């Protein structure tokens, strides 16, 4: 009975996987450019911190602590770029599969929501790379400058960088999702101050999911979510 619907999954998953593979090939063809784009803020921060250190006194750099770390980082970056490039095809096939399973009154909600979420995620990623990362990296490297030497390894740096970028994209999508929901009389200020009690528990659950089993990381991830919820409160209050 699931036969007429498992074939559609098979074909759409095949198309999405082919798109991901083509994107991986394209990204690995240009992995040097992507790696330079990723590590440019790190190099700029290291040079500025070196300037500060030479000013105070009157070295640190990007290293690789694993033998196959460089190749693995290149493969990871190419995989991420291929997934990002295949997001059009992946989401198109996903919607084409879900479309004949949704009522004729939810599509009109999903389409503008998806479009706005994608646009705001792009805006957030750009803001993180160009306005936040240059200052945050400088502050973090300067913090441990008079005590430790910044021998930053690429393998952890890529993960940290993509985590920051995706986190800022989501932190830009949620305060616009709140506005979109508040437009059509769905969520109001009172409705957002009464489900706060469960909201904080859900926030801590999400932080536990998205962070290692360390409690400190969980709190460090839950605080920004709490601030985003607070902002959402005023956003729905002024809607």
């Amino acid at each position: 009975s699931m036969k007429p619907h498992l074939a559609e999954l098979r074909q759409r998953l095949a198309i999405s996987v082919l798109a991901v593979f083509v994107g991986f090939i394209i990204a690995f063809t240009f992995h040097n450019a992507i790696l330079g784009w990723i590590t440019k803020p790190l190099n700029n921060a290291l040079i500025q911190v070196g300037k500060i250190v030479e000013k105070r006194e009157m070295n640190g750099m990007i290293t690789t602590h694993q033998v196959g770390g460089a190749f693995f980082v290149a493969l990871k970056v190419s995989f991420f770029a291929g997934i990002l490039m295949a997001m059009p095809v992946i989401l198109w096939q996903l919607w084409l599969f879900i479309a004949p399973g949704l009522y004729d009154n939810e599509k009109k909600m999903v389409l503008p929501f998806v479009v706005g979420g994608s646009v705001m995620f792009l805006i957030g990623v750009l803001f993180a790379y160009y306005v936040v990362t240059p200052f945050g990296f400088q502050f973090l490297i300067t913090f441990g400058s008079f005590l430790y030497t910044p021998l930053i390894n690429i393998e952890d740096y890529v993960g940290f960088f993509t985590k920051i970028l995706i986190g800022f994209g989501i932190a830009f999508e949620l305060p616009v999702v709140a506005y979109f929901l508040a437009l059509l009389g769905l969520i109001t200020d009172k409705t957002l101050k009464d489900y706060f009690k469960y909201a904080i528990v859900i926030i801590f659950l999400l932080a536990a999911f998205l962070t290692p089993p360390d409690v400190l990381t969980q709190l460090l991830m839950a605080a920004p979510l709490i601030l985003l919820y607070g902002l959402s409160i005023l956003i729905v209050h002024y809607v």
Binding site: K197, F204, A208, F209, V215
Partner: protein
């Protein structure tokens, strides 16, 4: 459990006791159990 530790479970429980409190803790647990039972009912229906 997929990058989750026990201390995190304790932090979430502390948050739950602190913010919900005397009431809305039993209610939240009851509703979570109801939702999980509904999910199990759905997976049972699928296996038919």
């Amino acid at each position: 459990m997929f990058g989750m530790g026990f201390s995190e479970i304790l932090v979430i429980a502390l948050v739950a006791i602190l913010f919900l409190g005397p009431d809305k803790l039993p209610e939240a647990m009851v509703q979570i159990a109801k939702f999980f039972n509904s999910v199990r009912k759905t997976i049972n229906e699928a296996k038919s």
